[PDB]
Symmetry: T
């Protein structure tokens, strides 16, 4: 059985690095993370100083 | 990193109050709840006595 | 077996009351209405005097 | 010909009143606003003091 | 309030049995599981020996 | 001209048999049923004793 | 209250004329047909002699 | 950079001519219109005398 | 078994004729073409002299 | 690099067996088929004698 | 009230830089740009010399 | 007439480079490749040693 958690990673560099930010968080706290699917991307502009790229991913991990 | 939980709030009054019901539950159990996105709305009719409005929301909270 | 009818309710007060308007019509004419799913919401402005909220719902009823 | 503008209204009371907030802005600045379609709804929580309901609408107005 | 978890069940027999695999896992670890919605179906071919049917479901459970 | 009715069939055995349940109902009451399209699948768990698979189909029938 | 029926019109000439075919059928049998929304278009090729354009529309009519 | 405006053209003849109606309006008022994408089609019936086909397009134009 | 190829037909006359343009190409090169589904429509404006209507279709053909 | 082909398998038994029918065809003619994603399911009724379940899948295969 | 404009940025380097290209244009001409949502990404190949990445974003700005 | 092939490119560096990987493969084997549309992005984690970014694109090429 896989389960997925819906995480939004952030980066001031790129949408790929914001996806990695989410995946890195998942691998800090979960075992057997196996793949991630991008579900949305956006950029925070007027709530930060430097633009911050955001990549939301469903990160799947195998249960047991 | 944000994470989102998918909750369905209920109310016998309105779709706004059913969204609040979900958000109130999230804020009971999670820190740093930051925003919620409505993903579906419906009304339970023939499983309750009074119609019950249901609002399903992805509720985002900031991790740490 | 459930069947669904696609109805748009209207209200000059709110999207919840426009959903009820549809559901009330379904319960006038159908037996065993069991739940309704909101599929679209909108507001008529320049075809009415007062804005009229519209909530389109699939209303499900159990057959027999 | 109709044209549509994509506006997000806000309210601390309800999703209907946040839709009205957008429509009121459109009618302040545009002639012949004729209808609005809800395209998304959400609630700002951790960027405000009181929750703020947001309703994004495409507001259509007739050209000429 | 309901909450949903996004699980992918697997089976070497059928998409129905892969949905049951997910639901069985949810009922092992959660109380008051109430319904599941299929969100995607697929078949793993070249990472297994026998084809493995996969059914991804949002499984809803009532909170408290 | 074809018309479609939106029916949810149920089965305690499989999603295929729940699709047949809907189609069988349509053919009980309609002439010239010609095809059905699956639009959603789900499983009722905590409102029944045995899990009940549900397959919602648009069932098309030719008019005249 | 509006209700919508999901009809597929056909024409050997064009997608507009197939939409009219559906609408004409609705106006034969329903009062107060008010608008139709195109939901899908396709062409039957290998089940007919001449290609037949098909336009599926939700046709809305006002109830009473 | 391209920008798009969301326009609904109308015609009493066809969905192609309603798309042209929108595009003609855009080219009256904008420079460097480069392409248009159809996003919805419908027919107004009970608000006009003759049916009026409507084609909504995102019309893209190159900025500068 | 059916297989589908994703083709965009073009016409300077209409979206129906652009769908035919794709289908004609498929029937030039494939046997047993059986139906086509429209998946997108658009108009090329600023890359041509006369507007060119484009209709993208999945064209299905029966294998063997 | 993976490439996907869009195939509709058929079966008179079940949607799982119709998915296998497509996959079996792909593995007859392609090397390194690695997974398949279900994209639509339906049932042919009034063009056959016995109902025929149809499962459309994107079947992915690794190139080289 | 927020309003959004639908812009396609371009870059010969990356999809992140094409999103920035759009956002930079919006900030040249609009005050209080607050966030951008990616809605589509693509690559122009046979209309340019070097591939050009394109990122279409809805860019939101706060009105007043 | 354009035709599109559905390819998933991979890269251990970025989603832009995974889109290029697909496009490079298409240009190895097809003439007149004209543009590509991103349809999905994901990251393989637990089937590789280093994360591998995947970008699925419909790559369009002009026929003749
Ligand atoms: C992608 C993105 C979407 C956003 N959407 C909203 C929104 O709807 N409303 C708001 O007050 N702030 C928002 N902030 C947003 C920030 C980002 C980065
Ligand atoms: C929104 C809504 C959707 C529902 N869908 C189903 C369903 O598919 N099947 C069922 O047995 N009960 C259902 N109950 C539903 C109740 C609500 C309120
Ligand atoms: C939600 C909503 C959508 C509408 N869409 C249209 C439309 O597309 N064209 C038209 O002539 N009138 C329209 N009227 C509309 C009225 C409402 C309330
Ligand atoms: C609906 C809604 C959506 C939002 N989405 C985001 C987001 O994606 N990222 C962010 O930094 N803030 C966000 N803020 C959001 C605020 C609201 C109200
Ligand atoms: C449904 C399904 C989808 C898949 N998608 C991918 C994918 O995108 N990329 C990959 O390397 N493996 C994949 N494996 C997949 C396996 C299954 C069963
Ligand atoms: C598929 C499925 C969906 C359902 N959705 C709901 C729902 O939204 N709310 C509720 O009270 N019961 C529900 N019951 C559901 C039952 C089934 C089987
Ligand atoms: C638009 C269109 C879609 C169709 N889809 C199918 C199908 O999925 N399967 C089948 O046996 N015949 C089909 N026939 C189709 C005919 C048309 C015109
Ligand atoms: C396409 C189309 C859609 C429409 N939708 C609505 C609607 O939702 N409500 C209404 O009062 N009038 C409507 N009028 C509509 C008119 C057209 C032509
Ligand atoms: C429908 C349509 C869509 C198009 N989209 C694009 C695009 O995204 N970018 C571009 O450079 N040219 C484009 N050209 C387009 C041309 C047509 C006809
Ligand atoms: C799933 C399915 C969809 C179909 N759609 C159509 C259609 O749109 N029109 C038609 O003439 N035949 C159709 N036949 C269909 C057959 C099947 C099995
Ligand atoms: C993303 C993208 C999409 C495009 N779509 C089209 C199209 O549909 N037709 C055309 O003539 N040119 C097109 N050009 C396109 C260029 C790009 C970059
Ligand atoms: C994007 C992506 C999606 C995937 N989906 C699946 C899947 O559904 N099931 C599986 O066994 N492996 C999968 N592998 C996947 C790998 C990637 C990279
Ligand atoms: Cl989710
Ligand atoms: Cl429907
Ligand atoms: Cl495809
Ligand atoms: Cl828009
Ligand atoms: Mg930096
Ligand atoms: Mg988002
Ligand atoms: Mg009360
Ligand atoms: Mg729901
Ligand atoms: Mg009043
Ligand atoms: Mg509507
Ligand atoms: Mg107050
Ligand atoms: Mg939003
Ligand atoms: Mg076995
Ligand atoms: Mg999947
Ligand atoms: Mg049994
Ligand atoms: Mg459902
Ligand atoms: Mg003729
Ligand atoms: Mg169809
Ligand atoms: Mg005329
Ligand atoms: Mg519309
Ligand atoms: Mg001509
Ligand atoms: Mg297109
Ligand atoms: Mg048999
Ligand atoms: Mg289909
Ligand atoms: Mg360079
Ligand atoms: Mg695009
Ligand atoms: Mg490296
Ligand atoms: Mg994918
Ligand atoms: Na989730
Ligand atoms: Na219907
Ligand atoms: Na394809
Ligand atoms: Na817009």
């Amino acid at each position: 059985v896989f389960k997925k958690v819906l995480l939004t990673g952030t980066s001031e560099e790129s949408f790929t690095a914001a996806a990695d930010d989410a995946i890195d968080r998942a691998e800090d706290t979960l075992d057997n993370v196996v793949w991630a699917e991008v579900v949305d991307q956006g950029v925070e502009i007027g709530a930060v100083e430097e633009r911050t790229y955001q990549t939301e991913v469903q990160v799947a991990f195998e249960l047991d």
